[PDB]
Structures are given as C-alpha cells and as structure tokens.
Amino acid sequence: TQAVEAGEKTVEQFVQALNKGDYNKAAEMTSKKAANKSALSEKEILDKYQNIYGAADVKGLQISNLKVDKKDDSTYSFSYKAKMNTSLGELKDLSYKGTLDRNDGQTTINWQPNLVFPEMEGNDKVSLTTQEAARGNIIDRNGEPLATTGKLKQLGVVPSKLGDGGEKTANIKAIASSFDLTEDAINQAISQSWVQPDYFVPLKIIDGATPELPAGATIQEVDGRYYPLGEAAAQLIGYVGDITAEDIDKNPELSSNGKIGRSGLEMAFDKDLRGTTGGKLSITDADGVEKKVLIEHEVQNGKDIKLTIDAKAQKTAFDSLGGKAGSTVATTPKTGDLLALASSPSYDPNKMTNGISQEDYKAYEENPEQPFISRFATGYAPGSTFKMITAAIGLDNGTIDPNEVLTINGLKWQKDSSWGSYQVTRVSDVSQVDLKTALIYSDNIYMAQETLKMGEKKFRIGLDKFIFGEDLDLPISMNPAQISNEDSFNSDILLADTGYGQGELLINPIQQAAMYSVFANNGTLVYPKLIADKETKDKKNVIGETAVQTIVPDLREVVQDVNGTAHSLSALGIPLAAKTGTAEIKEKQDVKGKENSFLFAFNPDNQGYMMVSMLENKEDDDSATKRASELLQYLNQNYQ
C-alpha cells in the first residue's frame, strides 16, 4: 500500500501526459531499455507515440477501472480500461495491461508496444484508411437548392503557353479583357512564390456560359460548394472554408482535407451536413500484412436539410432592398414558417468559399454598412410600429378608449416642465386624435400620453405576455428581446419612449414577426419556424380577441385612407393591413439623426403571409414602404 499507491500515481501521470499530447513527458516515466524492462529508449517511445497517435489523430485519452497489484518484489502489474477519440470515432472499451518497476524511490513503467494499442507486439505497424463523406445539401420548402456541391468551371492560365516576351503581354490583356478580370492581377498570380513555368495558376470561376479561351487560358472543371442564390441568402446560409490543422485538434472527426461551415446554417448544421468519415484503423504485422482491426465503418454522407425558405421570396426580398442597409422577414403567420430572411448589404459566398483575395475581404469588413451582419438576428428598437402592441395592451386593460379623442396642439409635447428640453415629436399636426387617427397618421404623442396614463405596471403586465426574455428555438444565433436594461424604467421619459417603440427596447426582426403574429391569429402568438419538419408551436391568449378585431380594421385604413402612411401600397389593389414606423437613433460616428424606417404588413383576409421590413440608417426620401411593392405582390399570389 505504501508503494502500491505510488504506483497508481505513476499510471495516472503517464495516462495524463498522453492525454495532454506531451509524449516526451510520458516517455521519461519509463524504465531503461532492456528485456525485462522497456522495449524502446526515450526518443524511440516518443517517435512511436507521435507517429501512431498523430496519424490516427488520437485525442482525449481517459481511463477507468484501474487496478494495481504486485507480481514480484520490485514489479507491480497494472491494468485499466480506456477510451480515446480518433479520426474514425471512439475507441470504447480498451483493455490495457503492463508492469511497473519499483527500483529505488522512483516508480517507472516497463513500456511495451501494447501500451499504444492493446494487441500490439514488437515491430507492429498501424495503418489508417479514410474515405471522405460528401457534404449534404440545403434546400428550400419546394426542393430548390440553396447550398449544394457541384461542378464549377475554373479559369486559369499556364505561363509556358503564354509567350516568351511581348506576346505574353498581349495575351494577359486578351484574357483580362475577355473574362472581367483585373489586368494587374493576372500578372501577379503567375508571379507568386509557388508558381512554376509549366504550372496551372487558377484565376476566376466562370458562373454562366464560357467565352473563347485566348492564348494561355484553359478551363478545368472542379467540384466545390455552390450557392445558387448568392448574396441574396449569404447571411442566412453562410459559407464553408478549408479545415485547418487547429480545427482537427478541436474535433478529430473532421476530414483532414474537407470543408467546415464558418457561419450561418453551414456552421450551425455542420454536424448534420458533413456526415461521418468512413474507413478502417487496423494493426498490421511487420511485413505490412493486416492483423487486427480496431475501428471500421462505411462512409455515411451528410443528410439534406429542408428549410421553410422560399427561394423566390428570398431573392425578391433581398433585391427590393437595393443594396441599402436593412432587412426583410416574410412569414406565414398561422404556422410560423419563415419564407424569407434577407439582410442587405451582403457578401458573395461563392467568391468567399472558392478563394477570395485579402483586398476584397478587407472591403467587406471595412464597409461601414457591415455586410457580414445578419440583420434579421440583430436587436433593434422596433420603432413606432410598436404602437400596435402598446395599443392592444391599452385596449385589454381598458386604459385606451377607441372613440375617445385627445386634443394635441403642435408637433412637440412633454408631460410636465420637469422633462427639461425633451419632447415627444410627431410628424402630422392633427388636432383631434383618437386611436384610429393615431394609427393612420402614426402619431407618437398619442401613444406617449396613453402610455403614461396606462402606467408602468399595467404596461409591463401586457408586455410580459409576449416573448421578452425567451430564447427562440431556431438555428440562428441571436439574443433574447428585452423591454429595457433593468426590470424598471425609473423614468417617465423612458416609459413614454417605450410606448411608441423607442427607449431601451431591443427586438430583432425575427422576434418582431413573432410578436406581430398575434394580429393574424386572433391574439395567439405563433413562434417562428425555420426547419420544414418542425411542429408548429404557439402561445395562446397574448392579447384579447377584442383588441385584434379593433386594431386590424384600423390597420386597413393605414393603407386605404388617403392620408395613411402606407397609402402607396393601395396601388397593389390587394387586401392589405399595414403599419409603418420610424426610429431615431443617435450614433456618435457623425453626430446626426440616423433614422430607421420600418414596415409591417400582412393579409387581413386569409392571414396567408406576414412581412416585416426595415431600412437601417435610411437615406433621405427613402422608406421601407417604397420598396415592399414587389414582395407583397408575390406573397399575395402564392400564399393565400
């Protein structure tokens, strides 16, 4: 027991040193090279672990069922079960045996080749064969490809077949002026460090038809991840990149020369799409002949993933933004299917995954509009579109009378003189404002007064019946919506601002479509759904059915009334109930009013579609309503 406990400590340190990848520290715990001792020296044990555990990508060696006895006077026998993770999976239940050595006051391990793998003997070799699994596809609700693996036309140049002098200058100009490529980049690619005279230097990937090949140009069809919608769904789908040496260290089950999802659904579903690597890890004889198989299973390709996205609605919603900063969400509000998740501006995922220069990558990250942001998953102030929620809350608790008319004089209003130089501002000087007039003209002073009349307690009681604080069950990384920073406003000004969707509210467009869905389900909140096979989840009795059948008739007037803020949508001639809205943000980059334009619209007859669009930091004379004409027509025809 005095030395049997110190012997178990030596086995614990030897296993730990192998687990931490430091094989030299484990080799120094072995006895000298002999017949009754260790079979190899210091550096020989090191190189054997570094080769075998390195080729199989062994990681995470942990043991159990450790038992150390006593064979001779200076020899203790140990044994333990162990498991490890390799390139082909898990090595469950491995019976290890060995003997210790209590020479002097330092116990060592009589190392044998059976400590690498159980049934290894002498000069036994280890081989590993692997077959890479094809990445699964991402399809829409109708089977259209959003992210598939197919053949790509690769344009390249051979420097030897270009010209010895003078002729090479005309061909580089003949290739740059025929494939829409930089004239100074074709010369730089053929003059890198890795380039040889007779090599094939790749350049650009031809998307559609291929033009005529000048002197030196040639096409070589290669395979790779292709995104048909391109930038129209870049933030949602994402892109895949080359797997690095450190990516394998975190997960040894990745292909050593495969593709790994870097963002979006390609990364959130990287396990379901990459499949599993097939092959065999076998111990062989000294002559190279097979002996014992440790792991073996066939290659299993990745499973396809079907979304609720509509490829046509996704491209229309993105193109309607015209490259401006903004986002658009289209849903079927009765089931929760996300028809389109557009974010603009965007980046090219095909150029991203098929070799991108670091100059074009710097343009993406240095763009002040930030095309890498998934704006449908970024928290914003909902804007004065939120006046629907504050009105519906006000109708349930009996605070707001739909027929009561407030008298508002001017464009600015403050409660008391204690507000200092702050005033709630409206755009239309309407003297007699009731609830219907406040929703048509988008009056902030009306809801600002009705919120203070309602009080903070009754306001939050109605607000807490929504999805504030909840984490939506979606494969999209996002933060939960919040009413404010703390559990109390502690400010009449902050309370009034929250009334018309300002203040410290933070709700991303996906969460907005969830809350606004109560107007298409008689007050029942329907949670959004991205995967097609998911079950519809709902939250009944968020607002009263009385408040819905009172606001929705008024929301029709926001489109039909000649002074309605969404009157330009009445040109469509379709049954529409909409609600506009703006939000003024005070950013510090250029001290000036950055205003965000919002639009919410849905079909009030069949509740077939629902849309929430936004223009971030909008230009002058621009709005989300000016751009929603095309998407609303498509959703009205195909989602009745």
Side-chain angles (χ1 to χ4, degrees), residues 94 96 98-101 105 107-118 120-150 152-160 162-163 165-167 169-172 174-176 178-179 182-183 185-197 199-206 208-220 222-249 251-284 286 288-297:
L94 290 183
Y96 281 78
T99 60
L100 292 176
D101 185 70
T107 302
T108 58
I109 301 104
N110 296 329
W111 190 92
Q112 291 291 306
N114 71 336
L115 298 186
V116 180
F117 289 117
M120 271 192 58
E121 172 194 15
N123 292 329
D124 277 336
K125 318 297 189 62
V126 180
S127 64
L128 176 57
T129 305
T130 46
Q131 307 96 32
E132 314 171 28
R135 171 170 279 263
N137 289 11
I138 308 180
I139 58 180
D140 78 327
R141 63 191 298 102
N142 285 15
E144 304 295 332
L146 297 184
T148 177
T149 304
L152 310 175
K153 311 182 85 69
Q154 167 88 96
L155 173 71
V157 283
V158 183
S160 61
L162 201 64
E167 175 77 0
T169 308
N171 292 328
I172 292 174
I175 298 176
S178 180
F179 294 93
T182 309
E183 194 174 16
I186 300 185
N187 246 319
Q188 184 175 75
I190 66 179
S191 58
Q192 278 293 331
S193 60
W194 66 270
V195 181
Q196 289 302 320
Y199 272 0
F200 171 82
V201 180
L203 300 178
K204 190 173 171 293
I205 285 190
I206 299 181
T210 166
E212 187 77 1
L213 307 181
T218 168
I219 310 297
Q220 297 185 7
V222 298
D223 293 334
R225 194 67 159 179
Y226 177 72
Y227 304 102
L229 284 192
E231 61 179 1
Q235 290 85 0
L236 172 61
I237 301 303
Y239 68 98
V240 294
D242 290 330
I243 301 186
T244 68
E246 199 167 6
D247 285 324
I248 303 291
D249 196 71
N251 186 22
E253 309 193 11
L254 306 176
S255 184
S256 297
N257 55 330
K259 291 293 185 176
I260 180 177
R262 293 306 189 186
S263 65
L265 294 179
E266 286 276 35
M267 182 189 59
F269 288 145
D270 188 60
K271 189 174 183 179
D272 304 62
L273 290 168
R274 79 171 96 102
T276 56
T277 302
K280 177 198 304 177
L281 175 70
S282 62
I283 303 176
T284 63
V289 183
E290 192 175 332
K291 170 185 176 182
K292 173 62 180 301
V293 165
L294 296 171
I295 307 179
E296 177 177 349
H297 41 67

Side-chain angles (χ1 to χ4, degrees), residues 347-358 360-361 363-365 367-415 417-418:
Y347 62 100
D348 190 4
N350 297 323
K351 175 169 292 185
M352 197 74 159
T353 189
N354 298 131
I356 178 181
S357 63
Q358 222 166 14
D360 290 2
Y361 182 85
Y364 284 151
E365 282 189 335
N367 193 330
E369 290 172 316
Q370 299 285 299
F372 284 143
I373 295 186
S374 298
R375 284 183 165 80
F376 47 77
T378 308
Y380 295 107
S384 40
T385 312
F386 201 75
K387 292 194 279 82
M388 305 179 305
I389 299 304
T390 316
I393 295 172
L395 295 182
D396 290 336
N397 53 27
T399 302
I400 294 181
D401 185 11
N403 296 326
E404 174 180 329
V405 177
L406 300 182
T407 300
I408 309 177
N409 296 325
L411 297 177
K412 287 178 163 55
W413 171 89
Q414 63 180 14
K415 183 196 188 68
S417 56
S418 57

